Structures are given as structure tokens and as C-alpha cells.
Amino acid sequence: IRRVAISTMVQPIFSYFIMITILIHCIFMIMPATQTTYILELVFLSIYTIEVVVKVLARGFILHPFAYLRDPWNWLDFLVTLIGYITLVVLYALRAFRVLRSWRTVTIVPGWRTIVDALSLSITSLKDLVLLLLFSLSVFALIGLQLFMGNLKHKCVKHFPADGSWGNFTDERWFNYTSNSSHWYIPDDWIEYPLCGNSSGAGMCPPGYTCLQGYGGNPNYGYTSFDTFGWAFLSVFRLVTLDYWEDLYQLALRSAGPWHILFFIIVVFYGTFCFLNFILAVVVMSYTHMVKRADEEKVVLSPFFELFIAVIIVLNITFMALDHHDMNIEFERILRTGNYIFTSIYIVEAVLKIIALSPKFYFKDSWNVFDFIIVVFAILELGLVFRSFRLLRVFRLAKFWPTLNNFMSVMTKSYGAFVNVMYVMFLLLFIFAIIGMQLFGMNYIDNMERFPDGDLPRWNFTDFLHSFMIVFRALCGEWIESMWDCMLVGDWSCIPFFVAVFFVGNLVILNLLIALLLNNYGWSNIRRVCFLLAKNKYFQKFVTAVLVITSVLLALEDIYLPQRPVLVNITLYVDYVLTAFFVIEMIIMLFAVGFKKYFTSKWYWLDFIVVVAYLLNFVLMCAGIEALQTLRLLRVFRLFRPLSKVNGMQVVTSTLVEAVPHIFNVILVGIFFWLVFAIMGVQLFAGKFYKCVDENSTVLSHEITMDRNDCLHENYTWENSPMNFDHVGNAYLSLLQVATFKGWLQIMNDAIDSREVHKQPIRETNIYMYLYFIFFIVFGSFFILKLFVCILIDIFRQQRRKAEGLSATDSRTQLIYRRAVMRTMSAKPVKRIPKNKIQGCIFDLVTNQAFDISIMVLICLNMVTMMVEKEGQSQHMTEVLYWINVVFIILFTGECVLKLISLRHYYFTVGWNIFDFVVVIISIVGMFLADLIETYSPTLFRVIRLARIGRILRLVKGAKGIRLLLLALRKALRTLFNVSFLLFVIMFVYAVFGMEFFMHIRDAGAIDDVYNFKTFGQSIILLFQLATSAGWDGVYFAIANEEDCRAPDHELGYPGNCGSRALGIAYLVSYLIITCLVVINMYAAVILDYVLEVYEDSKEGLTDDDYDMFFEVW
């Protein structure tokens, strides 16, 4: 018995058979359930029961160290088998989790130990981070509840009629009228009522309407609001994750006012640019430790011919990329004949190489066999669709391109880890897709009526394909809208599901892929006087002040400038003075530094271009020609000299300058892959996005209009989608939209409905086309776009090592010991004299730890009491809560006074004691000021009531891991501030240029009355939103429009209202490249470095806490 059990278990055939059974079960799970599936499930369950019995007989149940249930895998199998039998005997929410058994398949791919261990270590190490996450999220949720409570209920309500239609005015009649939903303003075809607010810069009502509060529900089926602590917490989490956050951002600013942007600036800065980087650093550290441990464990044959082949390949690539929709006969003739010529040339190539070189030698080389494969596909395709395979020819360019060759070599060197990570990703996606299908499949069908039009949405859990796709979307970073739909048709259980899918899929697996990439990819008197003036500090300070003042003056040129004659005159005279100032400065710099040195520098060249532009403007104005606004706007670029000289700024500029070439190379490689994918997409979807529409922009059913002829016969419009794959440029732009995850829903909606050309699209008639996008997203976003962060991390590490004076040849242990010595050098103790008998007793009581524990408990109680608050509460509840807060404040005051008396004047020898004292003063002052403010603006009262957060901020005191994280953040604060300042300068420059370019465009897309480029504040709001790439598709659609736009009339003075496609493309693409992919990532780099350091001080060395402990006994 025991012998038989052990012999059966040890044989690999047993494990192989179990694994094959698991794989067939997984395959059957995808297909819909039928009668045969029941018997198949029974057979699988019997097999699993045999396996469990054999293992338990071989080993034992728990009662010895090496029993059956001493292995987590055995535990998982046992629980799944028991759930199976429980469901066999008889809720239906437990049969969904049998798919967990599929996790075992991860063991097949060789090398899975490292990936699984890294995942486990990351999960274990997130313990210190989760608590800080919860605390920060709660604090931000409380702030948002205090700021935006009830603001999202604002609506435009029609004024009470004075004609007597509703009867004589009464309070009850007025309430009845205003409560009616038909009297609330809403534009036709809109789903959500627009928000309003009487604050300056907020949404304005149409004439005859008033902005009121407390009417109707909140946006997004009531799931978006700050009315209660839970909803505020959810909104703050959404903002931190940047999940469709621009919608909430715009709603908040439209309801409350532009100034509230400050709030969003904080949560984004601390939540996104810092904490998520802590998670990334933890994942990187885990993977680094595991990989380190694993490693420790242990004529024709002439250059001219090759150049000819390379040029032929490049001209074939351009011929291939020249394909587009609706080609004329001649263009197709040229492409066809060139294709024949290229194929003949390649056949000649193959025969010549086979003859000159021995066939064995020819087939020994990998590139030669690759070329032969290309030749055979070319012959097969010309003989007889095999056109797609022509794309293989493009890859032949890698042989003659050293950068691409090195990229491919690096990729193939470490394919195993990438394969393991991708397999883990797909297995997790499959498990969640199965679970979500089982949990929410029936909800969509049963409660379909709850949807706005009673129609099934595009994304749902009806079948396996849709569930897998929706989970993939959640992994990509978009989960809140799917969760909204699930709550609408489901219950609370959707929240934990989708939310979970976000943590594992996005914050761990993708971070693990980033860590993988990072590890693997990584006269004399005049001259003398002028020199003296030039190197004087006062002259430089004066120049910098003048430049800053002129930049601020530039910021005042808004849409309202023509209405202010005085401001116009100030600007004109300032420009006239600046021309002379620039000329004189150039002359002095020349006389000081010499022609060669002046013209050998890039900064002096920038100054020379600015001078030339201003002189050109001066001569144009003298001649009577209107000055070129861009040329005079060029002086903003002079601010970069003083910016680079800001203390602590050298490291950031050095990192960026050193990283420029690597960024350029990565951009070239991405352009190559995107060209390949764009050719594929053009071949797939060229000209298939046309559809038939009516007066109103709604697509007709294929039944009424079968094709183009019917559409034109019935006098309808045959319209093309703005985003399409008509030619290579449109394909590039669409792929850029897809990669950034902005506007991709519509793109793939059109793609999956695409049919033959000149045919009406049908809903989900080409579903499998999603595959084409999946691959791209895998290879375009998860790999190519993540090289920038790795490059920045490495270069910043090197530059920070350089700045501190450290040697590049030293090893990590040497640096750790050097830090330990430097810290050991500085240390001084101190003692406090105990207090007189009563004072000494009070001192002894206060010094006890139980006192601190009690204070912490009181802080927790007060924080909960703050959480109790909600929108629409009664006056009694509000007053009781305020009185409880007063009691808490008095208790804290008593504690502070007791500590002060006990410690006499030593209270101020500990920084946290000064913090407590300041918080006490602030609380006791703001508490009294609140009554006076409330008795005699609600926004001001809400803002000044923020002082309550100080007394709850004390909860961080006493922690160890949170203390370490805050230590790392404090060390990195200065570099973070410098990066933020650089980002602000870039945003200012882009704001002025955008305000110059797109100030008069007609309201469309994301541009409207509230959000536009009309003023500096609105432009800054839009650019802050765009710095994360959020909603840039709508901005592009608004600014790039060139249809139904009236041209400007110079004679009549009308400025025009028409956009510019090329200018908008350049603007937005350059901004996205500069900010999203380079400047933002810097944050991560900085964080990571500092974070890493502290841990290697805590684990492999000594920390300040160690010295404090040592001196405690001293």
C-alpha cells in the first residue's frame, strides 16, 4: 500500500497525466456548458480524488513534518477538490474558483522558480506599503469629503415662471416645480446633466436658469461623488491610479472653481509620482534579489553586393509602405512592377549565394536560411492570402542596422524570463476571466434593461472572449467603467474583483516586466571692462530678473488683451525696450568673451537666435508689417540658463542630457516596429471604416442600408471615421492612440465591425481582430514604451554617484560601509533631568509608553469620528460631531500642557514635540475662527476647516516601515522639487505657445467654454491634465479640425476659428514625448534610487535608528 503509493507518486508519468488532465479541463472550461461537460467534470473530479488519495497514503495527512498538507500546492489541490465535491452534493459562487487549479500549469515552463519566488517576495514585502497606502488614502478622502461634499449635485434649474402657468407663487409650489426633472437644463442627446457653480471661473448657466444644489443624483449612476467617506475613498483611489481621472477632474473644477486644482496637484504628486514608484522599487528589489541568488547558485561575397542588397531592401520597404486606399491605376502599376523586380532580384540573390557558397555552408547560417524562407514565400505568393508574409522582408534590415541587431541580440539572450513572465500574465488573465464570467455572466443578460438603451454594452462577461478582453482592459489600467457597469447590473462583489485585478495585473506583473527590462537592458580696456561687468554677480541677477519679468508680462496676453489699451501699450513699449536690451547684452557678451568662444556655445547660439528674431521683428515693424508673434514669443527660451543654475538642478539636467542619445535610439527602434505594425494595419483595415449615417450622427442598421449604393440612394451620408488606417500616417497616429490607451475604444470598435469595402459595418462581425491589437499592445506598450524609465533610472544612478563625489569603480558593499563610517562620525547624546515630587511623578507618568499608546488610540477614535461625517446629515449630528471634536481638542491640549510641565524647557529638543505644539496652536485657533467665519463664504469656511487634518497627521509617529519610507521621501524631496519646477517651466512655455496657436478654435471635442486656451489659467489647467496623456485624443480632435471652419478676415479683423492639423499634431506629439515619456519618468528614477539606498542601509548595513539605539544605553 505505502510502497505502491510512493512508487506511483515518484513516477513522472503521474504528474504528466495530471497536468494533461488539467489542461483539457481548462480547455473545456472555455466552451459553454452542456450535458457532456457534466460527465467530463465528474471524470476529472474522480481523477483528482485518486491523485489526492495516492498522495495522502504515500505521505500522511498533517501529523508529521513532511505530510501531505505541509505544502501550499497540496493545500490548494485539497481545497479545490473539496469545493468540487460540495458543489456536486448541492452556492453557485464557489464553483467559479475551480479554475485556481490551473495555476499549477505555471510549473511547466522551465525557470519558473525565479519568477514565482520574486512574485511571492514582492507580495510579502508590500506589507509595509499597504498601511501607508491606507493612511494616505484615508487622509486624502477626508480632505476631498471636506472640500467637494455635495458639489456634484449642482444642476441648472429653470426659473419659476411669472406668467402664472404653474399658479401663484408658494414655497411648496416652488419646491414642486424645481424638483421636476423636466425643468433641469440638459443639451439634447446628452446622458448627464451639466454641472454649474457661482464661483468665478466655474460653469455658467444659460439665461433663465439658476444653479441649485441637492437635486437629482450624482454622475455615473451615482457612483462618482464625495458625499460619504466610502465614495470619497473610491474617488481618491481612482485619482491616484489615474483611471479615467480627467472626467472627475473636469467635473470638480466645473462645480467648485479652478483654484481647487491645487487639491488635484497634491494627490497626483504624492499618490502617483511617489507611492506607485515605491511599489515599483519593491518589485525591482525582489526580482534583483532572486536573480542574484539564482546566478550565485549556478562578386556576391563582397561588401558592395551587401550594400546593394541593403539599398534594395530599403527601397522595397518604402514601396511597401507607400500602399494606401483608393490607389490610381498608375500607382498600382508602379508598385506591382517594383514588387516583381524585387522578387526577381531576391531569387537571383538566392541562386548566386547557393552557387558561390557551398549549399551546406549556405544553410549553416541562420540569415541565409531566413532569406531562403523569404524567397519561398515570395515565390508562393506570386504564384497564387500570403501577402502578409512580405513583412518578414522588413526584418532583414536588422542585419545591416547595428542598433536593431543589438536590440534583437539582447532580446534573444534572455528569452526565458520574458516567456515565463508573459505566461504568468496570460494565466492570471485566464483565471480572472473565468472567475468573472462565472460571477457576472447572468447579471448582464437578466438586468439588461437597466442599461441606458436596454442594449448589451460592448464590454461584458457574457462569454469567455469578452471576459478575457475585459480583464485585459483592466490590466491595461482601465477598470472603473467596467466596475460601474457591474454595479449597475450586479452588486458590491464587483468592487473587490476589478480592484484586485488592478493590483496583481498592473502594479505587480507589469512592474515585474519593467524590472526584467531594467535588469536586461542596462580696445584692451574695453574688453577688460566688459569682462568685469560680465562676470559680476549683480549684472547676472539683473538680467535674470528682467527675463523673469518679461516672461510674466508674456503670460498676460490673453483673449481679453485687445480690450485693455494700457496693457497693450505696456507690452509694445516693453518689446521696444527689450530689443535694445538684447542688442546691448549681445554686444557686451561679444566684447567680453570673444567671437570664437561666443559662437562655440549652444546657449550663446540660443541668445543669438533670440537677438536675430527680435531684430527681424523690429525691421518688420519699421517697414509697417505686423510683427511675427512667434518670433517675439521666442524670448521665453532664455529662462533655461537661470533654471539650470538653480541649486540642486545640475543632476537632473545632466541626466537628461546624457539620456538624450539613448532616447533617440529607442525612438528609432519604436518607429521601426510601429512601421511594421502600421503596414499590417493598413493591409487589414484600409478603407473599411466607412459607414452610413443620417442627419444626426447615428449609425444606421445594416438591414435598411446594405452597402454604399443603398446609402446614397436614400440620400444618407457615407462617412469615414476620423481615426483610420487609410495610409501609413493615419496608421501611425491610430497606433499612437492605441498605445497610450486614449481613444482606443472607438478604434477597435470600428475594427471589429469592419467588413468588405463598400459594405455597412455590423456589430462584432470581426471579433477576433482584437488579437491584432493585443499583440501590438504587448510589443508596443509593455516593452518599447518602458525602456525610457529604465534608461532614466540607470543614467540618474550614475549621475547621482558622480554628484556626491563617489568613485564609479567602487562596489556596493564599499559604498555601504563608507556611508556607515560617515554616519558614525557624527553623533552626540543628551539626557533630561527628572523633575518637585508632584512634577517628578508627572514626568514619570508621561514618560511611560502606555501614555503614547493611549494618545494613539484617541487619535484613531477622533479620525473615525471624522469619518462619520456625511452629506445631508441633520443639524443635530453635525453639532454633536463638532462637540466631540472640541472634547478631543481639549484632551490633546491637556496632554500638551502636561508634557510641557513635565519636560519644562526640554520639550523643544525633539522636533516632533514642536510639531505637536504647532498643531495644538493651529487647532485651538482655527476651531474658534471657524465659528466667526460661519456666522458671518462656504468655500472659505471649508478651506480654513482643513486645519483639523494636523491633529490626525500625528498617527504616523511611532511606525518603523512608514518611518523608513518617509526618510527616503525626505531625502528625495529636493530632487523631486527640482523636477517639478522643470516640469512647470515646460508647461509654462507650452501654455504660452498653445494660447498663441489655438485661442480662437470653435468649441468641439474636449474644448468648451470652461476648458480652452483662451487664458493662461485655462491653458495651464489643460496642460496639467495632458501631462499624464489623459484625454489628449479629445484635445487633438478639437485643435486639429479643419472642416466647417470659417477662414480669418484680416480686413474685418476677425481672427478666425479654424484649426490646423499639422500644427496640432506637432504640438501634442512633442508635448507627449517631452512630458509623459521623459520628464514624468524622472520621478520614478529618483524615487527608486533613494528607496533602494535606504533599504540597503537597513538590511546590509547600519541605519540612524541603530545609532540611536546604541546611544540610548550610553
Ligand SMILES: CN(C)[C@H]1C[C@@H](c2cccc(C(F)(F)F)c2)CC[C@@H]1Nc1cc(F)c(S(=O)(=O)Nc2ccncn2)cc1Cl
Ligand atoms: C460646536 N460649536 C458650537 C463650536 C463650539 C465653540 C466653543 C465655544 C465656547 C466654548 C468652547 C469650549 F468650551 F470648548 F472652550 C467652544 C468652538 C468651536 C465649535 N465649532 C467647531 C468645532 C470643531 F471642532 C470644528 S472642526 O471638526 O473642523 N475642528 C477644527 C476646525 C478648525 N481647525 C482645527 N480644528 C469646527 C467647528 Cl465650526
Ligand SMILES: CC(C)CCC[C@@H](C)[C@H]1CC[C@H]2[C@@H]3CC=C4C[C@@H](OC(=O)CCC(=O)O)CC[C@]4(C)[C@H]3CC[C@]12C
Ligand atoms: C514651484 C512649483 C513646485 C509649484 C508651482 C506653483 C503652482 C501651484 C501655481 C503656479 C501658477 C498658479 C496658477 C496661476 C493661475 C491660476 C488661475 C486661477 O483662477 C483664476 O484665474 C481665477 C479667476 C477666475 O477664474 O475668474 C486659479 C489658480 C491658478 C490655476 C493658479 C493655481 C496655482 C498655480 C498652478
Ligand SMILES: *[C@@H]1O[C@H](CO)[C@@H](O)[C@H](O)[C@H]1NC(C)=O
Ligand atoms: C413635470 O412636469 C411635466 C409637465 O407638466 C409633467 O407632465 C410631469 O408629470 C412633471 N413631473 C412629475 C414628477 O410630476
Ligand SMILES: *[C@@H]1O[C@H](CO)[C@@H](O)[C@H](O)[C@H]1NC(C)=O
Ligand atoms: C408636483 O405636484 C403634483 C401635485 O400637484 C405631484 O403629484 C408631483 O409629485 C409634484 N412634483 C414633484 C414632487 O416633483
